[PDB]
Amino acid sequence: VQFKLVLVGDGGTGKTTFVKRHLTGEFEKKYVPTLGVEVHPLVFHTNRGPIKFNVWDTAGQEKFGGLRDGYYIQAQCAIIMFDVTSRVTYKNVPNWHRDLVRVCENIPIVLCGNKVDIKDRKVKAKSIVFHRKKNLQYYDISAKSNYNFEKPFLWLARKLIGDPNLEFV
Amino acid sequence: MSTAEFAQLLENSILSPDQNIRLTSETQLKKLSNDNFLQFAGLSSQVLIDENTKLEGRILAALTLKNELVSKDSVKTQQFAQRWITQVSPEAKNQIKTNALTALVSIEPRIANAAAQLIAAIADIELPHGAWPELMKIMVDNTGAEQPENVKRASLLALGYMCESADALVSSSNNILIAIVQGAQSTETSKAVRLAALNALADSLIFIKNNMEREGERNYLMQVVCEATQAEDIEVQAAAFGCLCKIMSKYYTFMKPYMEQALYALTIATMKSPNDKVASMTVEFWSTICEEEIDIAYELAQFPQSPLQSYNFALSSIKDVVPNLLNLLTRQNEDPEDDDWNVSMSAGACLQLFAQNCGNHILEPVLEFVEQNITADNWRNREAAVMAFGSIMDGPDKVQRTYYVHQALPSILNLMNDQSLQVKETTAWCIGRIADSVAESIDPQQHLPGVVQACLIGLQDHPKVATNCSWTIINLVEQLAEATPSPIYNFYPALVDGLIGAANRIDNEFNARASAFSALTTMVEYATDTVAETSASISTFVMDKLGQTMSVDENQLTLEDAQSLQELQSNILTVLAAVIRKSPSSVEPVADMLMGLFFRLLEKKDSAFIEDDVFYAISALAASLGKGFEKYLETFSPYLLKALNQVDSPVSITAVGFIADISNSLEEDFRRYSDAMMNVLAQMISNPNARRELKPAVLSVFGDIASNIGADFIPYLNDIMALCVAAQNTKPENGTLEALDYQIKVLEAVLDAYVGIVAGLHDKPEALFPYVGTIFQFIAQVAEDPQLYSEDATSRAAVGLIGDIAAMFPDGSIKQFYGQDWVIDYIKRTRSGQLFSQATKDTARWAREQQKRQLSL
Numbered sequence A: 001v002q003f004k005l006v007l008v009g010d011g012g013t014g015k016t017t018f019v020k021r022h023l024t025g026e027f028e029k030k031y032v033p034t035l036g037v038e039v040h041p042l043v044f045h046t047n048r049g050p051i052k053f054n055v056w057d058t059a060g061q062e063k064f065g066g067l068r069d070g071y072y073i074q075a076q077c078a079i080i081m082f083d084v085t086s087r088v089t090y091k092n093v094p095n096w097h098r099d100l101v102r103v104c105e106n107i108p109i110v111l112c113g114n115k116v117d118i119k120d121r122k123v124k125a126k127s128i129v130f131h132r133k134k135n136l137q138y139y140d141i142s143a144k145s146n147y148n149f150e151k152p153f154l155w156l157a158r159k160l161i162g163d164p165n166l167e168f169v
Numbered sequence B: 001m002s003t004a005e006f007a008q009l010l011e012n013s014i015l016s017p018d019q020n021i022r023l024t025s026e027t028q029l030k031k032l033s034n035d036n037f038l039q040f041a042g043l044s045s046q047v048l049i050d051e052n053t054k055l056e057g058r059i060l061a062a063l064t065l066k067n068e069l070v071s072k073d074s075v076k077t078q079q080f081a082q083r084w085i086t087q088v089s090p091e092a093k094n095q096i097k098t099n100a101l102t103a104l105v106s107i108e109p110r111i112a113n114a115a116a117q118l119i120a121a122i123a124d125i126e127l128p129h130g131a132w133p134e135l136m137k138i139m140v141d142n143t144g145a146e147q148p149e150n151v152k153r154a155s156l157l158a159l160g161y162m163c164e165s166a167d168a169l170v171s172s173s174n175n176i177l178i179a180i181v182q183g184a185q186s187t188e189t190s191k192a193v194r195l196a197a198l199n200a201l202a203d204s205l206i207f208i209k210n211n212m213e214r215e216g217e218r219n220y221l222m223q224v225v226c227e228a229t230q231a232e233d234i235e236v237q238a239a240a241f242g243c244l245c246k247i248m249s250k251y252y253t254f255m256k257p258y259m260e261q262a263l264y265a266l267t268i269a270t271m272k273s274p275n276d277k278v279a280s281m282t283v284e285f286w287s288t289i290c291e292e293e294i295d296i297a298y299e300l301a302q303f304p305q306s307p308l309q310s311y312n313f314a315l316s317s318i319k320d321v322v323p324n325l326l327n328l329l330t331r332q333n334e335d336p337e338d339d340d341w342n343v344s345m346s347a348g349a350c351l352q353l354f355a356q357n358c359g360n361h362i363l364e365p366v367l368e369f370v371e372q373n374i375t376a377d378n379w380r381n382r383e384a385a386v387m388a389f390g391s392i393m394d395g396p397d398k399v400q401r402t403y404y405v406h407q408a409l410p411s412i413l414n415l416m417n418d419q420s421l422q423v424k425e426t427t428a429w430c431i432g433r434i435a436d437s438v439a440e441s442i443d444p445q446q447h448l449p450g451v452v453q454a455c456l457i458g459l460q461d462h463p464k465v466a467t468n469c470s471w472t473i474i475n476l477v478e479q480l481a482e483a484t485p486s487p488i489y490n491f492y493p494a495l496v497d498g499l500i501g502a503a504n505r506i507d508n509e510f511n512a513r514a515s516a517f518s519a520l521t522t523m524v525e526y527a528t529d530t531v532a533e534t535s536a537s538i539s540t541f542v543m544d545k546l547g548q549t550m551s552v553d554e555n556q557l558t559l560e561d562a563q564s565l566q567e568l569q570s571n572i573l574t575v576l577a578a579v580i581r582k583s584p585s586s587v588e589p590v591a592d593m594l595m596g597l598f599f600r601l602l603e604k605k606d607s608a609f610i611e612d613d614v615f616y617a618i619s620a621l622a623a624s625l626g627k628g629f630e631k632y633l634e635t636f637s638p639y640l641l642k643a644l645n646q647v648d649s650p651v652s653i654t655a656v657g658f659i660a661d662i663s664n665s666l667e668e669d670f671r672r673y674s675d676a677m678m679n680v681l682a683q684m685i686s687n688p689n690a691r692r693e694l695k696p697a698v699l700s701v702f703g704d705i706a707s708n709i710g711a712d713f714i715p716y717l718n719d720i721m722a723l724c725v726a727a728q729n730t731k732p733e734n735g736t737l738e739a740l741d742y743q744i745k746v747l748e749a750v751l752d753a754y755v756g757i758v759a760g761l762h763d764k765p766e767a768l769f770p771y772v773g774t775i776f777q778f779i780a781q782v783a784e785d786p787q788l789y790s791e792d793a794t795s796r797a798a799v800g801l802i803g804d805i806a807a808m809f810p811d812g813s814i815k816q817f818y819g820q821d822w823v824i825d826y827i828k829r830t831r832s833g834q835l836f837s838q839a840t841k842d843t844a845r846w847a848r849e850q851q852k853r854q855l856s857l
């Protein structure tokens, strides 16, 4: 049981950091722009056996877009990430969503506001209204403090498997 | 290159399980694009319509050719435009276009979708130059009723994309609008076509403005979208409401007649619908309405002459809409730990917007509801009531909120004893909404105790409940402690005690542990002397706790177990950092504990996650201990260099800061560590990865070091004089706001460096002698630029250098500088008027007298 998960968002929002942590437990400090895509399998040992997300960690910088929305082909679910520290990264969320759904008709998508550990947010809970307009699930996340670390995958797994009682622990 | 070989690369790019194949294939596709675009485009168009190629490869053919035609970057877009126009032969253009149109009518919809995207991309390039004139007729004709379902669908889609990115199209707009709206009217078109039309209308809304600004076209369009709201199919309804929302956002101005004549009545009806998806759709419509009316209020406040005006749709509808929204608040999920977004949550958001938009007018219907459900049989009703109350704590004026909080609080506080988990969860939240918005509505003598008691109950309850209490305690401490007679401290011991209980939870389920640590952080942030014993209980607790987490290193458990632990150590460090940045009094006595713990933390593997936090924490501790930190400087040195070298990170800047402080707290004893620091500091600034902020930090720290280090700086003197000579001759990067304010920041940091150097080398004039000209050259820029000399501090420094330098060379070695006109004139300007303070004028006197001696030598 495996699913293709495309991970998208403006450059420097913490996509690779998020995934590498889930993969190995290492917190990458240096920001190194992803070149096209890094594909890595993540397995979660649930109460209903293991579920595997083949993660497509896509580039955020136009320069290094690679195949861009070519990577969305056959994606069964997605994570849109923005940086709560950077208003422009939330301003572009609607674009990321659009480019996704034009290729993946009807998939479950989680919206993540990363970097909530940083002191002064520039995008407070008040401004985060997109989940609401397009019936997505939103989470505050921090790839550094590990706030809600497993949530996006837990929610996706449930919706994907169609079982509301799925557990990770 | 063969069409089949090309098709295999495309398939391999996304379908190969071998990562090296994928990378190689993508690389080969890219160079083919660069070297022979003509061929790339052509082959792409052929794989698109190739029946032998897998779906994914055909879809990818269309998308990647499109990604070589259009671009998010506005220069790339012009480059790509021109490339297509000049490199692609007219023979190939027609071949590509013809293939795209064929692909557009494929019976396989995902191919037609991609073909729709490629067609739009080519239209962006060609239509502005009046090329591809055949397209509109094709596109509109494919929308004909007699055309088969798929041909209509993908064509409407293509029209959508086309308009949305648009820059014939304009003179074809009526035909587009009609073709789009046509495809949505008539109940008996295919669901997919009807859907495709509503979405195409959405994507096109901005580009049909001139159509929307005509009673005739607008009315037609609005008739169809309204009918679609009353489709039996749920998705078609969702598409319709989707357009209504956008239309309300984009074209609020024209909405009053449609509201009055239809929408007002249709949306009240559907808000009642027993289907949650339907009621949701219509709640969003009303939230949109509130949002655009709220933004209008801001707009009139800053442009009171604006010809725009609110129609007060919300206000006018409160009698109908708000009761129906309050009714939707009782549609929560039975499962207390579902968390799936539903119509009740949508209703709450909408009610907050109604409060924020209608203010006081919201009070009557909401208070009638609250009072009537706050103690009802059903938990859903009890929870909806406390939900409702918190949703109106922002919007009404301070008087009203205080009055009704005062009145309702006893009932609200009382709900912490409810059997329902949801009721308690929302009750705790409601408390925090009161605190965060109207803290001074909670009289210290008769309400604040009942609140604290409610929070302490909830910290011992289900974790979902305890999480909210922590956030509520944070709110309380924030909005209360800003009042001069702050009554919260009276309860600090009771709160800090219960918070630690929650922080000692077995796990961090539902963020109840992480919440508590964040609260403890706040309790510390806002601590005073009055509460030192309890602020000390916190540091004692977390230090013990940190040491405890370190007992078992990460590489013993599962990844999952490690990350939960590292979350806890991050949680602890937030508190530990705040304690050190307030009262080091309670950790100076155990300085070795913290440092012992910090050094251990930085020792072990997989520390990158806390490293910066620990570094920040040590720095702040070092600031306190002053000379007291020297006994650690040895073992801390590796980590300091580690931090300094991360020139792309902010951690390097506080590392520069750390050096500033220990150089100043120690002085002549910094000479023992001076060289290893400077060997790094002298590199940092010329590192191609150095941040902007780094340069002036480093420039200034040379000042610090030199003044404390004296003769020991000489080996680095020339290298530093080069760095701040290059810096002082650096012009703004452009002409903008920051451009110059940064350039000034740099210039002020050069000044810090010379001041520190002259101070440091008081006893060693021979070493400074070769640079007198360089410094006087910099002082000329000060005298020249108002952003420099008009700053009082900068002038007093500049004119003080003039004097101090003179005092070092009493043999007339440098007297030629003191006879220049600008120097006599600059000293004079500094002793004049008010601008410059007395301290500046007295330094300018000193410089004037020193300068007179130079001439008389």
Ligand SMILES: Nc1nc2c(ncn2[C@@H]2O[C@H](COP(=O)(O)OP(=O)(O)OP(=O)(O)O)[C@@H](O)[C@H]2O)c(=O)[nH]1
Pocket (backbone or CB within 6 Å): A009, A010, A011, A012, A013, A014, A015, A016, A017, A018, A028, A029, A030, A031, A032, A033, A034, A035, A058, A059, A060, A061, A114, A115, A116, A117, A118, A141, A142, A143, A144, A145
């Ligand atoms: N403070 C803080 N920093 C974070 C957090 N998450 C990631 N970072 C940092 O943010 C930077 C961005 O990391 P990346 O993961 O490479 O960003 P990205 O989204 O993959 O960038 P692209 O590949 O260009 O799309 C790194 O320096 C991380 O250390 C966080 O939650 N809090």
Ligand SMILES: [Mg+2]
Pocket (backbone or CB within 6 Å): A015, A016, A017, A032, A033, A034, A057, A058, A059, A060
């Ligand atoms: Mg990345």
